[PDB]
Amino acid sequence: TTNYWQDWTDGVGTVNASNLAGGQYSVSWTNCGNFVVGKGWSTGSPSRVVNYNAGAFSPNGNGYLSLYGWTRSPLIEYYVVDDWGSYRPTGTYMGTVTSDGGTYDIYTATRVNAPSIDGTQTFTQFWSVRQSKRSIGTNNTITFANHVNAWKSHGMNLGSSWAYQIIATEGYQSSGYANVTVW
């Protein structure tokens, strides 16, 4: 089961996050800047099968619910986005993957001198973004290998050093509430 709790905020606005029992967490936020909260594993794996149930996910404006993590060597921030608020995230279109009963658009982007796990850096994002919002309150699976192997087909190769891997709630200039269980 999960072994890791993430609670990162840029300190802008109010983000109240709770590390509940087991794989469960809750977050209430008001006029945030950027935050990432979630549960998962301190060391990511390309073969991990991730399960979650979002009891609530109600962003007022920009918020994502995703499988989220980083690699180093080189520095890559990756997302498998199942739900979003007002803004569907996009980048440069690479193609599509069908996994766990949904179709995802695959995108790349570069972030130049941006906040990272290793401070201000230039890094790449790999995205799988679902074409429609996934059901809330359902036991949902992400078969991450399908995304990794789809990304590999487009030359989107992850780094050799694996950092954390979580079901994350992320806000940007928004308010909202989320309650999520991960296993």
Locate the domains of the chain by residue range.
Answer: 4-182
C-alpha to C-alpha distance for 169 and 57, rounded to whole angstroms: 8
C-alpha to C-alpha distance for 148 and 167, rounded to whole angstroms: 16
Backbone angles phi, psi at 144, to 5 degrees: -55, -30
Residue 144 near residue 9, CB atoms below 8 Å: no
Q: How far is CA 77 from CA 9, 43, 80, 124, 165, in A?
A: 16, 14, 11, 6, 10
Residue 174 near residue 60, CB atoms below 8 Å: yes
Q: Solved by what technique?
A: X-ray
Class of domain 4-182: mainly beta
Report the candidate in 75, 60, 95, 65 with the shortest Cα–Cα distance to residue 181.
Answer: 65
Residue 81 near residue 62, CB atoms below 8 Å: no
C-alpha to C-alpha distance for 96 and 105, rounded to whole angstroms: 5
Helix (H, G, I), strand (E, B) or coil at 180: strand
Residue 141 near residue 51, CB atoms below 8 Å: yes
Tokens of 100: 């766990």
Decide the pairing of beta strands 34-41 and 102-114. unpaired
- Give residues with Cβ within 8 angstroms of 142, minimum separation 6: 49, 50, 51, 52, 67, 80, 82, 99, 100
Residue 176 near residue 31, CB atoms below 8 Å: no
- Give residues with Cβ within 8 angstroms of 164, minimum separation 6: 4, 6, 40, 41, 42, 43, 44, 69, 70, 117
Neighbour tally for 25: CB within 10 Å: 26
Say what the resolution is, in angstroms.
1.8
Catalytic (active-site) positions: 77, 170
Helix (H, G, I), strand (E, B) or coil at 156: coil
C-alpha to C-alpha distance for 32 and 113, rounded to whole angstroms: 21
